[PDB]
Amino acid sequence: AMSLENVAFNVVNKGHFDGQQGEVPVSIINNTVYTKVDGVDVELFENKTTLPVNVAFELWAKRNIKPVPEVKILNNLGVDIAANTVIWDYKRDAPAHISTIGVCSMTDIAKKPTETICAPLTVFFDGRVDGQVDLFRNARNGVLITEGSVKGLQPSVGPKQASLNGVTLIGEAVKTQFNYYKKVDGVVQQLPETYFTQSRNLQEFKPRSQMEIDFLELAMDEFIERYKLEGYAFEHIVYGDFSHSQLGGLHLLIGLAKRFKESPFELEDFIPMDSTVKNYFITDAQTGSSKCVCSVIDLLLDDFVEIIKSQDLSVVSKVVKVTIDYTEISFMLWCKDGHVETFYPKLQ
Amino acid sequence: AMSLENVAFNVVNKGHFDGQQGEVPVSIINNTVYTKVDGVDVELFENKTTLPVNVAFELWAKRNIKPVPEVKILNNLGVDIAANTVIWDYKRDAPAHISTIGVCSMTDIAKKPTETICAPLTVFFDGRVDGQVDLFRNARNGVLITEGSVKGLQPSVGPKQASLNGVTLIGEAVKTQFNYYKKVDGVVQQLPETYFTQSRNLQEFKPRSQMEIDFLELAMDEFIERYKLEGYAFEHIVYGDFSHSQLGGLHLLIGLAKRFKESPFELEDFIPMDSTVKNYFITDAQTGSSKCVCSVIDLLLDDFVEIIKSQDLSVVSKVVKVTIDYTEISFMLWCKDGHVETFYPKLQ
Amino acid sequence: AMSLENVAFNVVNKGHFDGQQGEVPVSIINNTVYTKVDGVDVELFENKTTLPVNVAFELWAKRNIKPVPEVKILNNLGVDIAANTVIWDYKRDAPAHISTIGVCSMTDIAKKPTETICAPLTVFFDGRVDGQVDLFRNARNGVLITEGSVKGLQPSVGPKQASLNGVTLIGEAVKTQFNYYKKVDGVVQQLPETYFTQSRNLQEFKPRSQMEIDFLELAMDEFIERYKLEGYAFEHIVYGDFSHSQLGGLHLLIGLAKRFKESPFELEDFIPMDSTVKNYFITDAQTGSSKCVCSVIDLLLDDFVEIIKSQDLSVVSKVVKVTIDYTEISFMLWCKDGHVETFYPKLQ
Amino acid sequence: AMSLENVAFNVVNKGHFDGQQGEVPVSIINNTVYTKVDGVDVELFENKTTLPVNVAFELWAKRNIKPVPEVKILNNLGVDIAANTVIWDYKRDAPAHISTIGVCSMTDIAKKPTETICAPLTVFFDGRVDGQVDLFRNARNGVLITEGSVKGLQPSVGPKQASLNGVTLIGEAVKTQFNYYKKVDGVVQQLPETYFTQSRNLQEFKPRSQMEIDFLELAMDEFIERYKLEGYAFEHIVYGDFSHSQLGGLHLLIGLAKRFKESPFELEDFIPMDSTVKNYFITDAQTGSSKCVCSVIDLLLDDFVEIIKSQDLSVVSKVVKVTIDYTEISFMLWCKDGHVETFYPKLQ
Amino acid sequence: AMSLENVAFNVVNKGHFDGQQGEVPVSIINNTVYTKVDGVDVELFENKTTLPVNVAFELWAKRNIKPVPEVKILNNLGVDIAANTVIWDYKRDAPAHISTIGVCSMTDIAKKPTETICAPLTVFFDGRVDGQVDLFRNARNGVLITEGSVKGLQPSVGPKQASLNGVTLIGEAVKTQFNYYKKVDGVVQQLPETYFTQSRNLQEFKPRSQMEIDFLELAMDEFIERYKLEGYAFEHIVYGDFSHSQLGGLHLLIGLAKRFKESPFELEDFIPMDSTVKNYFITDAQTGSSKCVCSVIDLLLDDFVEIIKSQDLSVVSKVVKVTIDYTEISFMLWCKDGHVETFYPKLQ
Ligand SMILES: Fc1ccc(CNCc2ccccc2)cc1
Ligand SMILES: Fc1ccc(CNCc2ccccc2)cc1
Numbered sequence A, B, C, D, E: 001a002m003s004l005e006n007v008a009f010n011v012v013n014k015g016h017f018d019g020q021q022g023e024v025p026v027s028i029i030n031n032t033v034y035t036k037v038d039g040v041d042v043e044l045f046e047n048k049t050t051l052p053v054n055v056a057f058e059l060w061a062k063r064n065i066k067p068v069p070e071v072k073i074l075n076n077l078g079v080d081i082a083a084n085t086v087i088w089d090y091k092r093d094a095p096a097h098i099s100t101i102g103v104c105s106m107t108d109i110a111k112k113p114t115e116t117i118c119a120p121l122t123v124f125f126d127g128r129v130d131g132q133v134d135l136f137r138n139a140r141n142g143v144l145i146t147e148g149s150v151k152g153l154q155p156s157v158g159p160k161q162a163s164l165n166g167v168t169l170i171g172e173a174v175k176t177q178f179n180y181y182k183k184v185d186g187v188v189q190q191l192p193e194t195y196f197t198q199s200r201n202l203q204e205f206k207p208r209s210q211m212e213i214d215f216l217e218l219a220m221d222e223f224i225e226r227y228k229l230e231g232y233a234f235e236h237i238v239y240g241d242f243s244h245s246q247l248g249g250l251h252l253l254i255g256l257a258k259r260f261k262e263s264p265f266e267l268e269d270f271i272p273m274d275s276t277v278k279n280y281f282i283t284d285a286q287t288g289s290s291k292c293v294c295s296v297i298d299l300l301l302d303d304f305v306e307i308i309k310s311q312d313l314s315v316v317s318k319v320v321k322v323t324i325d326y327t328e329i330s331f332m333l334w335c336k337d338g339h340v341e342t343f344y345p346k347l348q
């Protein structure tokens, strides 16, 4: 017995849709959902999605309030829909999927993922929910996350971090590291050996290794000397080159964070969404150096060092493919006389 | 247990809100209420009101589908709100009243007209509903319509016509003529002696007396001779004067209807609402004569002749107040040498 | 090379999208698509769909401008999507299907109906287009219309009428009667024996048989005597019963059209869409008789007489299922002492 | 002292902006301007323009309520702006010009047409307004309409018809035929010899010559014999050819009007604006014949016969340029063995 | 070959419109431009302008991504339009000019600034673009910025700072100080000797002279003693007077910045735009002192000291006109017994 007034009642008294019974007066004026509280209209939800206001309101209310995989991971693993839940994309203020399975009468393509309409879709199953592991086994295409082992199925250990209500974190009171499983056309497909991005903020950056603690504390010349990174172009790639009108390098987020405490800069996120490699139109406020498309990845500095110090440096220009967050991130490695010149996450 | 989906279910399966149980998927895109019918969004309601889309949707669904007094009569009798119903203003595509009594949680000022909030409002009571006559007796201010006689109360016989779902008609299968009662500050008022407008369409005009049958059939000179209307300016007032750049007269709808069969014309209803006297920016397509504000009343021709012959014709210009549809309509009577020049419903 | 400006160029110079090259300046203000014509913004399209303005603009521009099956027939045959065309629903001012195959990059689920995403959808194939008959043979689910005979396949002769640009007509200069074929899970289905609705307007009604010519010309008592329809309740079912406050019967459009010449009435199409049985909130302007849900079907009078005389009249109330426009329409047959009382298209 | 509330006061009490003083409460909800009338919001204006709601409201209120040249004539004469008035385009529900001279503070480029900003614009001057003829003399570019003769200036007699409040008419109580004058770069131009379109409706068509009276009354074979039009392709050009799937000809509105009495048809005005030649996506309801772009001109039949008989019929295909409504209209004349095949207003 | 999809393709792959070829799917829902990225709609632009969504999208995409003069400077110099570029007003989230020259088909008044329509407009020319200096020479009215000297033309050295992508900065890797030239009616007009505002933030304030370093470090009494500013009312003008219910003075931004580190305050920018003198409705959170219109200018403290210590202090109240950012900023100087009382940027 689903209604706009019942969804709004749950939002008011529970913080989200909890399945409780009751109704509150609701008014819809344009893209905002209001509720009458003692004679005054109070704002409950503002629709920033491409879905009707009341439909988006309900999907937001029915969002998954448990630690869930980050949207970048589920996209990298080809997820089209989520089974009996709404994975909310907080980076886009909209559902990660536009169609649902057993969530909202307006977006539901099916009530159960067993329906033949779901067959060609990679459905996401949450093993922490009863019967979801069995549904993964019966579905043609899908992705499964589990807290433990699923008998017979070879797991892929995922990232330490999951997104809890938009807050990406490594769980202390909750489990955020999941075992991942994928199926394509009924066959369990083996997930590749992968690196993971650390999902850190530029303004809230914290080092997660001694190399990262040393990068932010030590100066450019002594860090490169301490970690033997001579001839690997860290001065351009990680640190940046703001001397000319076009910003040079600055492809690792640790280098951007080190730069941010000295000089502020405008990172224009021209495609606001979650991805393994993010692109920004950067403008440096101190020098006036700028780059229209500055591809930035947040790898653990040790992992970027392991990738860069595992490449052949004798080719003028070659594509270096690396598996990060399950997807193959192609990099452009440029060399000269046995030393690196640049190594950026190649733009496609 | 009121909801958007339940109101929409009733609209789909019953034509209006009938109190039935059930829900249909609803989507709100801007000011339109849609419903999913076999995978396609079908339009259910387009909000032309100043109220939120879903609030207006519900009040429209909960509209009174019985013959009710025309909004002009209800305004003339100073009604503010309706008791336990929604009088829908089809001429404005909105409720006749913005606040309700026991209809919608969003517009309800009270659940029962007995509440002290209703005390200063002239509440409309429908005698055909059980207990509404008793509520009129207990209310401080109000208007009551009844099909029969009320104990002790002296009635006022209203118009022959009522509005059934926007279609104004004189009932054959239903009763449309009501007894009217009014109360101001607890005191049963004596309603005035009044004329009634006939509420006819220009394109669907039908004569309702031998004088009206003769007006439309006979020529100007013959009709005025037959009914001895010489010196009463019917040639200007009723028939019209399209010889100059400014349209002369044409204040009675019977003369507009006679004119409409011969030559078409543009009536610009610049204030779309129901009123005893309607104003139109008229442009005659044949001659090119026009009038910015052409006040038109639809009186029975016999009633207009009775009013015009009941006047003193010795004043150059005087205001002639006539009680029509219970309200006092001011007319401007202009005379010259004992004869009328014009008699129009005063632009005030 | 698809763009908003190119679609708009085609609309301006060709009347619809014809694949021509060129661009015109376009401006989008809210839900309207405008074009600059000599310095003035001219309206090109107003979006009445649930899709983004520019997406709907393109699908409308790319609509099928050839006689196509009526949306009621296509729904009745369970069609989900059209192959390499846009069937435009003129009764809803929106595409008949929200997803396309090889039409618009925004709505396209696939470029060709052979893609595995189309497999569970009943794709509509137009035999008049090269290679569409072969695609029907290869598709798992689908509906096929052809002007001629298909090798091996047993046809179903459809309605005489098709919809050409929203104008339903029986072709004289074009062919509008199609052979229909259906496939479910790869198996060519045997379509049922069906009656067809005549798709006539209330205001533009024309008789299509001597019985219909006699119905509109003769009086109630004479027609029923001439065609020996005594005891079949035609006086209530077809003609109508406007004597009481609730309109009795009036389920056949021929009786509504006969009534319309004498007295006008308000048909409130509360679910604006194309269907075999249409429901209307009717209000008769002469009597004041009304019905919230008045189910109306436009069968050829001969076909309704053949259906009503092919029934057992000994049950107080039974459901009579009739295959009309390929779908099973349930009727409610009410009898008393061997005679009919009512026979309406069941409100279910 | 201009305000939204004062414009709205004038609209309510005068039908349009008359310069009167006073204010009424106004509320703006989205694109509609409402006014509070006795506690209920009444709609005053719905913005169908590309301008802000209140700006468009004011320009509409300040529209020219005198017979003015039709927007097709004003465009043909290359007018950009009107001097101290608003020419309202009723075919587009918007001002004919987006910028004003002494009308609205929001759209005003200048308070007087003498300002140097107006210098490169062809300003329209209405001779019926005091001082407008003198302003035409002083302006660099402009168009002037007058009821009488202007000293020294050689006139161009315009169309018999002008547009009075959207109603195109030939004045009986007003003058609608104007003398036209044009100036380009300070030089009084000699306007060309021109034909005029008759600006008639398809549904409200009236013949304006004996040839037009004979066209609508006589049959195709009789009319062509009476007026000796053998070999001029009137059977295709004027009458139409609905035998094939593509509608043949039908370029003259008199032939469309003759056709309309017999069979109805859908004229899709895909570019809603006023022009000398109008294009329509036509669909004939009887035959099912259709044409994506059917160019239609309303010339007096005598003028079309004078044009078609004034041509050389020995070229397979040539462009025939005709001055109509002051603009050069290109026609495509197709001949074969000394006879016409088609002569349509060229799709360019 | 300009299109919405091509502009959106450039925004996605280049950060701005770079002239590249290609298209991405675009959807417009209300005032937001979305793009389909792997089946999910990602937001690309939200229209905060008074222009149509797609028109504003294109002008924003085509914005000048080089250091350009600040909008306050170009307004002060009377600029109406920019030649073959879009100067984007980041303080208003809209183009600095509503009409373009060779940028967008919808906003273009001309393709080249040489067109006679541009003649009365002060067109902005960027000398850094090939042929723009020659176009300035040929234009009737205009403003020209150059990095070097233009033979014969007497330059005006502009501000040290220019706006690079909304970030106002003094160039280190780019040149931000330009030579300015102006022409009025074909004549090169001599630019006045002017002071420049420093364009600093209240929250991000940095001193740019020893006097400013001393103002923020030293207390009120020792700064005024060190710089001999006794009897010049710096205690009221620069520092502020929060003792009464109406805030006293606080007209220099350096004084506001000094105050901000001690006590926070609400600066209500009631006219959000770039100007030499900014007005704010200030409310001091600590004391509760407030001023409806508090005019604030950011002059270098040395320049304000040079202006105040160059005035005659014997008049009770006089207007002191000073040229700042090329425009004459009139100040109100109030004196008493040879000492200043107040000196604020006079409100007009
Ligand atoms: F839970 C969900 C998480 C993410 C999504 C959207 N992923 C779209 C995609 C599909 C195929 C390949 C790459 C991306 C949908 C639901
Ligand atoms: F049923 C209804 C019918 C009419 C109304 C609105 N009447 C407004 C009014 C109030 C006082 C004097 C004049 C007009 C409200 C409900």
Ligand SMILES: Fc1ccc(CNCc2ccccc2)cc1
Residues within 6 Å of the ligand: B038, B039, B040, C071, C074, C075, C076, C078, C079, C080, C081, C082, C087, C096, C097, C124
């Ligand atoms: F051409 C088209 C015509 C019609 C449609 C929509 N039919 C929806 C439907 C699906 C299943 C059963 C009943 C109705 C889609 C495309």
Ligand SMILES: Fc1ccc(CNCc2ccccc2)cc1
Residues within 6 Å of the ligand: C038, C039, C040, D071, D074, D075, D076, D078, D079, D080, D081, D082, D087, D096, D097, D124
């Ligand atoms: F009164 C008016 C009537 C018409 C207009 C608009 N005419 C636009 C145009 C300009 C140049 C050539 C062709 C068309 C503006 C005001």
Ligand SMILES: Fc1ccc(CNCc2ccccc2)cc1
Residues within 6 Å of the ligand: E071, E074, E075, E076, E077, E078, E079, E080, E081, E082, E087, E096, E097, E098, E124
């Ligand atoms: F690049 C541009 C920068 C600024 C503008 C807007 N300046 C408007 C103005 C005009 C006259 C005097 C004062 C202000 C337009 C384009």
